[PDB]
Amino acid sequence: MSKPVKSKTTGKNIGYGKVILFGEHFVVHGAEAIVAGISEYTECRLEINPGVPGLQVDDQRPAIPGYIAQKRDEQIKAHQLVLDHLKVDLSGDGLKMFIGGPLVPSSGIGASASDVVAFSRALSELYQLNLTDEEVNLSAFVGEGGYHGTPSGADNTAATYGGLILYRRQNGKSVFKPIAFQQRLYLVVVGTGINASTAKVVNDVHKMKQQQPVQFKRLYDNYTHIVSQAREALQKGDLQRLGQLMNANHDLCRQIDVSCRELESIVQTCRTYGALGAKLSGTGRGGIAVALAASSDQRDAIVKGLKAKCPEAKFIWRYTVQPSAA
User: Fold this and answer.
1) CATH of domain 2-180
2) Which entry of 52, 65, 233, 244 is 20 to 30 Å from 100 by CA?
3) Annotated active-site positions, please?
4) CA-to-CA dists, residue 183 to 136, 142, 227, 295, angstroms
């Protein structure tokens, strides 16, 4: 068992949020996906709790209403998975856990991964485990097993590493590599307030493929062209084109029946107010959408326009993706 070396963490142990820029659903069928680990993060602080067994959680994240209550049981399992994985024993002296950071937990933003990532990092600090990024990512992956199934890996990987990430099922598992990019991405992410079941939607997509092998294959190849071009746009630093491609991607998502009225309303208003591109992000049929802005100022216009004109935009967040290099 790991014995605690420090009495209190003093570092900044965080896990980044996540949005899928390209390729939700199509990735299941072998397409490349672009996932963005955002700057906005969840932080975990730990200290010893002498004489008091177990893990005391003081969850102060700015989560949407009801989110923390509704995820608590899964969180309990998630945290215990990480403790067991890291060989941490809280049966004598326990730990007080404070959870913070500016990330807003809500369906679609990868918050559960940000949680287990931040936790793994703080444990590494307190127990002086010197976890590598790979080791943290695995710990997060194990812990993500405590939230409702199933982890592909993209959420923990974005939360651990941040930045842009190429995500594909290769050769027969999830494969991830970083994407070099020299420009800030100014994002508006919007929550619908509607919860979707990944497993259920993904299986609906499988069924459509079984019912329409030739049509599906058409949409799938249509996708592969967009992502190819998206990679180009990024290497060039061409954000207008990147935005147009996001629009094209949303269009394809509508054609596999994973959008909804609320998502459509949001994306229409984002484009109206000058988004370079806008699309559902992740599972669809609820959850979040993401818009790309050309600057911080034009983001102010999109947020203003959503608030005045789109009642379906229940929660509006300004998030950013950091450039990998100068």
Assistant:
1) 3.30.230.10
2) 52
3) 155
4) 27, 33, 18, 11
